Structure formats: C-alpha cells, structure tokens
Design a binder for these strands. Sequence first.
DNA 1: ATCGAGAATCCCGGTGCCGAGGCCGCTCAATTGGTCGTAGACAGCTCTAGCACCGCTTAAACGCACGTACGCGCTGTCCCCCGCGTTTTAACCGCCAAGGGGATTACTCCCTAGTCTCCAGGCACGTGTCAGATATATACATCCGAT
DNA 2: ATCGGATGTATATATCTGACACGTGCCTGGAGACTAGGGAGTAATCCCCTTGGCGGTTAAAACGCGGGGGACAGCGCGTACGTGCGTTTAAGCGGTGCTAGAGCTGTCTACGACCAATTGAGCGGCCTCGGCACCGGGATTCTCGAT
Lengths: 148, 108, 109, 99, 99, 85, 83, 82, 93, 94
Amino acid sequence: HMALKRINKELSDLARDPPAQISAGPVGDDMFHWQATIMGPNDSPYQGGVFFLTIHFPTDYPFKPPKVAFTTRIYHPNINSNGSICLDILRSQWSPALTISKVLLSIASLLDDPNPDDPKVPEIARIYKTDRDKYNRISREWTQKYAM
Amino acid sequence: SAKACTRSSRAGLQFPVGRVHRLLRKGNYSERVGAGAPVYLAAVLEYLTAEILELAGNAARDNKKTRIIPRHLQLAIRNDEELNKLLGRVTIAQGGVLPNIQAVLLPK
Amino acid sequence: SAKACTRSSRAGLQFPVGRVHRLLRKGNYSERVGAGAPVYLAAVLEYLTAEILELAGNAARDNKKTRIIPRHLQLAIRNDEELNKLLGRVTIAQGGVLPNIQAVLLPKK
Amino acid sequence: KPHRYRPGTVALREIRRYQKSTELLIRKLPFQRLVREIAQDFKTDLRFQSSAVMALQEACEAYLVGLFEDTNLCAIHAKRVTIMPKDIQLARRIRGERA
Amino acid sequence: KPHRYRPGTVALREIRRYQKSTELLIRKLPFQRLVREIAQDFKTDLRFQSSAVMALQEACEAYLVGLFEDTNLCAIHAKRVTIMPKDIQLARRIRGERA
Amino acid sequence: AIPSLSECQCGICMEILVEPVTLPCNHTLCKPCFQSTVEKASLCCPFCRRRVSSWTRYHTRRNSLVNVELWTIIQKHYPRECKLR
Amino acid sequence: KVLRDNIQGITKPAIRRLARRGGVKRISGLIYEETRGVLKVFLENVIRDAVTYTEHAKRKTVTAMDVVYALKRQGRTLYGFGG
Amino acid sequence: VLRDNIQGITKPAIRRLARRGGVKRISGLIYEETRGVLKVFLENVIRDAVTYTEHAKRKTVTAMDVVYALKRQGRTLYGFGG
Amino acid sequence: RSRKESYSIYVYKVLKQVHPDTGISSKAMGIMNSFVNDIFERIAGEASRLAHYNKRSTITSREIQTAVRLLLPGELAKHAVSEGTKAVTKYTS
Amino acid sequence: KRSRKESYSIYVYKVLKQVHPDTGISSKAMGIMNSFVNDIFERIAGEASRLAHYNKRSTITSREIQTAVRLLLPGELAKHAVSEGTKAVTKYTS
DNA sequence: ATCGAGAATCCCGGTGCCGAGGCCGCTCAATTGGTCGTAGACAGCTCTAGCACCGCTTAAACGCACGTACGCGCTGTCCCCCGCGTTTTAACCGCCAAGGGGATTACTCCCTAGTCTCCAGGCACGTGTCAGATATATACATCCGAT
DNA sequence: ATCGGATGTATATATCTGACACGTGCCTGGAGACTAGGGAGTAATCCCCTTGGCGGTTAAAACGCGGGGGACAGCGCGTACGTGCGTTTAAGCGGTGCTAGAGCTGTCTACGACCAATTGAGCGGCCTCGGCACCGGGATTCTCGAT
Ligand SMILES: [Zn+2]
Ligand SMILES: [Zn+2]
C-alpha cells in the first residue's frame, strides 16, 4: 500500500545522503523489518562502540510510529535492559512528516547527552546527577565488554 | 502499547488516569468499573480543556496580553457555537458580557 | 414497638419499608444505608400520594364521576399551589389544560 | 336573511370546546409518518413500538400548546389580539430555546 | 453657549463603557448588610465567610444583567425604547420565574 | 505565477494533491492524508505542529475544508497524474 | 420506500386547534410555517436522543421507555407511559 | 439587628446594571420592581445556603454552601471552588 | 415470564383510606406509579449528594430530612417532615 | 500542616504549555478551569451511571462513556471528543 | 449637503510592586504481582407484536366568496427622563485587637453488612358485572338584527 | 333600552359492553438470628479568620433645574382574516397473514476486585523577577450648533 512506497522512498533517501556513523537497511525479503548500526559519538564515553538496533514498521505507516529496540546492552538511563527506549519522538510528539533518518539522529543526540528529568531507570539517573566519574567508568567497561 | 511506564503515558494523555480511575471507583457511580473507561474519560476531558485554552489564548493575544484572565475565558466561550451551548447555564465570575447594542437604539 | 409484626405495620405505614430499603441499598447511592432512612422516605411518599389522591378524588366527585382519570389528576395538580410548583416541568398524559381566557379577548359590553 | 355569526364569536367558542377536552388534536397517521421520516437520518430501517409514537405525540402537542400560550401573551403585550411569527420568535428567545 | 450633549448620546457611552469592563456594579457594604439582614430570618447568630458574600454578589449581578436583556427585548417588541415594569413582568412570566 | 509539478507534492504520501486542504499555517496537503492524520495522529499540523482542532471543527460544518481555487488548477493543468490516481 | 414531505400532514386546521387550546382568538397567515419549523426542530431533538438510547442497547426497535428517557433528559418529564 | 437595607441598592447601581444589560432609556418605576425581584432571588438562594450550613452542624456559611445552592437551581457558578 | 414490581396495591390502599367510595382507572394508576418513582429518585439522589458533601458513607434519617426540606416547597416540606419524624419515632419503639 | 487538596492545575498548565508555549495563566482562570473539569467529569460519569443502570448492568465500560459523550456534547464537539477517546483507548491497548 | 470648537478616548513612555513560576523536601497513593469468584458474551429456542395489504364509511380537509374590523401609519400634545452643576453622605483603605469556631487527632463502641434458613406477600391469570359512553328527545341560555 | 327568531348547549332516560375489582396458586424476596469490624460519636487542643472600632480622603450619591424627545391618544384606510357552503380526499376501522426480533435459558471464559510491598508523583512552603497597573503628556476622533 502507501506504506510500501513510503518505505521505498525512505530507503532511497537514506542511500542518497547517509548520515554520520549510522547505517540502516532492510533485514531481508520484506521492507517492513529493518536493522541499523550506530557508532558512539566522539564526545561521549561510547568511543568506538558499535550498537545494533531493530526497527519494526506498523502496517499503517506513516500515521503510526515505528518501534525501535536496542540489540546490544548499553549503560544509559534512557534504555532499559531488554532494549526499551524512552524518547518523545517515538511515542509522544510523532508526526507523519518525520523520517527514520530523523529518529536515528534523535537517538544519536540522546547518546550525546541523557535526560535525567524523565528517566527510564531512576537509580542510574540519580547516580549520574550525583557524580560523573562512576558513570563514565562503568559505561567504559560496558562498551568494552558488550559493544566491543 | 508496551508496559513498564506510567498509565497516562501509554495512552499519550496528560490528564491522570489513575486519579480518574479512583474517582470513578469511589464516586458511587456503579458497582464495577471497566479498565478502559478512565482512559476514554481522561481523553475527553483533556480534549475539552485544550479546546477552551486555545481560544482563550487567542483572545489574550488579541488583547495584547501574555496571560489569561476570566474575561478571556468568557470571550472564548461565548463567541463559539458549540461551547456556548455546552456552557449555557454556567456563570463565569469576573467575565462580563459581550458588547451588543440593538440597532433600534443607535442614533440616526 | 413490639418488634413482631411487619416493618410497614410496625411504623404504621402502608407503603413498603423493606422494598424501599432494598431499592436504597441496590440503587448505587452510598456505601451504607441507615436503619431509619426507608421509614422516613416511605412516610414522605405515602403523604404525597395521599395528598394528590385526596385532591383528585375531590375533583372527580365535583364532576359526578366515581373514578379518577388523568384529567382529574391534572386538575388537582394545576389548581393547587405547592403541587403545581413541585410538578412544574411534568406533563400528564391525557390531562388537557386548565381552562382560562385572557380578559382582553372577551366581547365588549 | 340567513344566520351569520359576528366575527370572533365562533372562535371564542372553540376555545371553550378545546380547553374542556383531553383528546389529541393532530391526526395520527400523518404524525406517525413524520416521525418515521425524521428517524431515517440517524439510523436506517428502525421499528417503532406502538407506544413510542404515542409518547412522542403527547409530548409534542403539549409543547406546542405551551408555546402558543406564550405567543398569545406576547401578542397581547404589543396591544394586539392576533399572533405574528415575531411573537413566536420572541417567546422562543426569552424561553432560551434558540438564544 | 455652554456645550450640552443631546439626550440619549451619553447613555450609549455608558452602555459601551460598562459592557467592556468586568467589575461589580453594586457597592459592597450595602450588599453585605442586605445579605445579613435577609439571612437573619432563617437562623440567628450566623457568620458569613468573606467569599460567600462575594459569590452571592456575583450571582445576583449576573442574574440582574441577564434579566435586563429580556426586559429590553420586550420593550423593543412593544415598539418602545423605555423599559417599564410590565416588560419585567412579561419576561419573568415567559421565563418561568413568575407564572 | 503558476506552481510546477515538483512543488505540488504532498509531504505525507508523496503523490499529487487531491482535494487539498490548507491549514491556517499556510501548509497544504491532500484530504485523505488530513483525515488519516486527524483520525490517528495528534490532531495538529504534521509540519508546523500547531493546534488546528477549532479550525477543523468550524470548517467541517460548512464543507469549506477543500481549497477549490487550487483544486481546479491542479485538476485542469495536470490531468494525467490526477486521473491515474 | 423512503418518505418525503410528510410535514405537510400537520395541516392548518390542526395548528388552529392547537392554538385554540392554547387560548388564541385570532391567528395570522404566516403562523403555520413557523409552527411546522418549530415542530420539526423539537421532533429532531427528541428522536436523536431516543435513537442513541436504542442503539446503545443493541436493539432495532425504539421503545416507549427510550422516548421517556430522552424526554426526561431534555427536561420534559412525561407521565403515563412508564418510568 | 438590621432593617431597611434594601434601599442601599441605589438608583445609580440599578442604572449601571441596566446599562451593562444594554438599556438606553429607563422609566421611573423600574427601581422598585428591581429591588423586589432581587430580594426574592436573594431569599431563594440564601435559604438553601443556610439549609446546607445547618445540615453540616456549622455556624459559618462557607462559599461551598452558596455554590451548592446556586448549582441546585440551574445557576452554576465558576470561580469560587466546586 | 418475568414479574414486574409496582406501587399499585399501596396506592389503592391509600386511595381507599382517603376516599372509600371512589375507584381509579389504569392510566391514572400508571401516572401515580411514575410520580412515586420520580419523587423517590429525587429525594434519594439529593440525600446521596448531601452524604457525599460531608465526607460520609451512610444515608441516615437526617439526610433524608434535609433532602425533603430542600426539595419540597414550604407547607409540603413541613408536613412531610412531620409525618416522617412521626413514622420513625413510632417505628423505633 | 494544612491537609493535602488535589486539583487539576498541573495538567491544565501542561495542556496550556502544549497549545500556547508562550502564554501564562492567572489564578482565577486556573480555578475556573478546575471547576469546568470537575463539572464535565460529574456530568459524563452520572450520565454513564444512569445509562448502565437502564440496561441492568453492573459495569461502566468505554461504551457507556462513549454514549454519554454522544448525548451530552453538542453536534460537532461530540464527534471530535469520541475520536480522541477512541484513539486514546486504541493507543493504550496496544 | 459642510467648517470648526469643546469634549472624550486611545497611544506612548517611565516607574514600581506583587503574584506567577520554578525549586526542594517528603509522605502516601498509584503501580506491580498474584489469586479467585462471577458477569456477561454467545449460542439456541419461543412466541409477540410490528408490518403490510384490502375494502367501506364518512369525517375532516380544501377551495371559494363576502364583508368587515383590526393592524398600521400619521399627527398632535404634554410631561417626564436626561444631562449638567453643586452639596452632602458614607464607602473604601489601612490599622489594631480579641476570641469563636473550624479543623485535626486519639479512643472506643455499636450499627450495619454478610450469611444461612424459612415462609408468606405480592404477582400472573381468570372471571363476573356495573359505570360510563352512545343514542334520542326536550328545555333553556345566548346571540344577532331592529326600533 | 327589548323584542322575537335561530342556534347551540345542557338535561333526562334507556342500554349494553368492556374495563375494573376480586379471588386462587405459588415462588421469590423479605424477615429472623448471629457474628465481625470499621465508621462515626465524643473529648481536647490549636490557631485561623471573622467581627468590631477608629481616622481620613474622596469617589459616588442626592438634590434641583431646563427642555426636548418619546409615550399615549385619536382618525382614517384597506386589506387580511373570520364565517359559511359545497366538493374532494384520505383517515379510521375491521380483518388476515407473515415473520423480524425482543425475551429467556444454559455454559464458560476472561475480566475486575482484594491484598501486600514499594517508591516516585504531586502537594506544601519559599523566593525572586518580569508583566501588568498607574500616571503624565499628546494625538486622534466622535459630537453639536451654525452655516
Ligand atoms: Zn498525501
Ligand atoms: Zn503547517
């Protein structure tokens, strides 16, 4: 339907000018399921860390937001253990004009800095707002153990 | 929707769903209360509140102010076809009345 | 009282106290219901019924009839002062209207 | 030679005749057809109980009579005896029906 | 020689001024005294919260202002511009307050 | 001045505008996309993100939603794509 | 099997009889169309709520009780048909 | 004790109320009629307010009693609670 | 079949207590039933509102008395209150 | 201290910041909004309770509140309110 | 048709003050997890009454004609609201002072709900008869034209 | 002021028919006895906020006068509504036939209430700064008498 054409144009646009250090593509025979790879931003404790994400497109696109989930384990107040993501783009302020490139850029910006005001995990959020060295250290070992 | 977040965010609303559920359970309305009624009621209340507030803010911007006083609420309500019908028997304190002079009384 | 006979007879009423108690309990009005509320409510209902039936019977007897019909109920309600205010917004089916004509319309002398 | 009644002395008699009766004044089949026609927009192929039409008729006739009383009072206020559409409009406005 | 406004052109100015404001048009102390005097019949040694009097004042003013619109409409319907007590009586009867 | 085909592309379905509606923010999009957005999205402009509930409610009762002036232009100038879809 | 122009069945004599019961001695010639319009508005207002009530109950027949409920909801209590 | 306080609703106040109501010309017998109808309205509202107060075993007439009395008569008021 | 309850027999008993020689039709009986149901609903609802306003969970006789005083007009309210108080006092002993 | 008193102020302010991200609100206006929300809640809940009692039920479901909204609101407010509530319930379920 | 003078209202710039909005601590109510009793969703059968059609009366509706009374416009009179000026009265504001009663907390006790058992009161069904509606023939109130 | 038609309403008598009042079977809902616990009554304390008084200043009310515009009454016209008669129309009544759908019964499965642990959302108390109120001066615009 319209969703198939929209996703095809989305893939074409992503191919024309791929963004910085992120790469998404269809998993296989169908365009509905996607997989993406993200690099840790330079101004972050996730240096050289590869992260994998899975994207599921609801059949009623673009009027319903896609659902993205982390595949690897990351230390961040906005990501739960199983890969759940807390972001306003995916659930709250989604409009049909948005693109997968836009949500990926939003995820990258989330990796740039966290949002402790409304966190998914409050304990690591308060420890992050208490001290900096502990979070940076533990994120370093998390990205050295799981990301790399 | 996936669980493990507050109830009022799964529905995408701003008005509380737990408070509305409790007010419906203890309000002496019915013996049992369904699981989807609070969501629907909160959505309706939020829609009506946004509907009133948008017109009130428009009137406030018309009057060169950056604040909403009861006069702006009265202006927003009375100048709308359906909102006036909904709040017809309701008096708003410090709201005044709309300007309207009958054409017979004007000078000729 | 003697705590022996029926509650309606114990309180000296004709309207049921047990039925009113059940209706108050199952009507979704409050969590609990006192033991004297049905008696009070039944007494009030019986008083109002007796008042309207008395006035309607008077209206029927003034019309050389031995049965109350909705017209007599309408006449009794409209003619009275308090019962017309209590039933201001109520429509009685097959009740008609109270006869009056504005004095302007009557023929000139 | 033939008998003729003065204008207004037969209409002052129908008032007494129709204020002493309780019968319905609108014919039943046309009103039932009007009710069935009106209820076609909201839901198609409905069925009406024999009492639903009667309830609607007895409510609507009473409403019309109550409106006509206020219309007559409005006409009398303007120092007339006949009732114009503007009397109905003023009565409806003051009652709050149209505002 | 002194400048004088013709009758009716200052009443319109007051109409435009008072329909633009939102204040209370009755003095507060006389209204509070009237409220207390009226309430002294039902129960003695009553005390009134400072906002109960304000609520009563707002309700009374919003009632009188709404009554005067119907009174003016009755007066205009009677082909006049001066409102008279019979206009108030007709408006109250049609509304349902007098009957 | 007349718009071209490239500048007459809907921002949602990426097709030719049909029965277009122009929101008060001077943002235009075709009627089916507008109805789907109002039914399932947040009831705002998908681009501007401003409340248009009152405007839609007031203009639905009079069937004045469509932009006839540009609708006729699109229906006349470019029959091929509009007739095809 | 649709119906049309059945508001003309509320004839002039019927409106005159309703006015006579109301207490009207003289009637103008334009009263009848106004009365028909008011009649239509009132009937639509009542029947909309009656049909809503009967649709919530998963029925295809409108009962006397639905009409009574709609009238009571609109502020005109009716006696004699139940409730 | 207080008596004859209905005359504190002066002629200028009634004129201001009429002007806000949209009245251009006022006769001379309006003021007494307005005083009477306002007195009736005040009695009707205050009676229910005092009944609500007396049920709660209180001696102070709160704003909640006034709001409930007004709402009981189809005259809902916004701004003082509720 | 299903049985439908009504206040018909009690209304007839009151009628024979007031006017021993007058009967009643069927439509008048239906109107009486509707009137009794309406007054029951009014008084019970107002009593519930009074109980809720004061943070109570019980509907006692004083709340019914206050509801009666608020609903009925002057003389009707006075006589209804007197009759209800008499009935409760006679019932309690 | 003074006992806690719940109100709808926070959510009204949130909605206000959603619709007009540069406009404040007074305190009297906030009280009026709170009263309006309470009144509409009571109206819809009472209508739904009566509607459920009519059909001999024991539960207030989304259907009852939907029909109450259809009854109470005017012609065009009801459609949009029903659409918003249906969208909210659909989003909440899945 | 207009020119111009006196009065009222809106615009603009500067000053100040208080309440609107953001922040911090915390207490309790909303969320999660698990269990269980029952409400209502669905399938199946019955039999009620809602719908459609047909023919016969005759009651109400409709169209037309005449005439007349009432709605509406015009003119005249007078008197009562309105606009303005000066004087008198008390409302509004800021301040201080006392205590009445509203609001919260703790303890207790007794009133009401839930459960089981039992039986009679009120509901459905059937029947007989008399109150009231209908038909018919007088008696009188009422209306309208004419001196 | 009536006088006498002419019409319509009210009154009295026969009659017969269907709805009202009463009687019978029974089955479901109300009464009776018992136990448990939480809601409400009562006493005590705290402190908020309601009532009362005093002095000043000044905005609003009261009183009075001149007059002009609006309310009210009287005349005249002509047209629109009422009353009556004859013709066409479709309501009202009875009777028959069919079936859609309301109404009731039996199973059972998923939904909602209860309960215990927990912790974050939302409330109360504080504090600061900008939006709005106010003042002083000027520009603009209705208004009215004179042409
Ligand atoms: Zn599109
Ligand atoms: Zn836009």
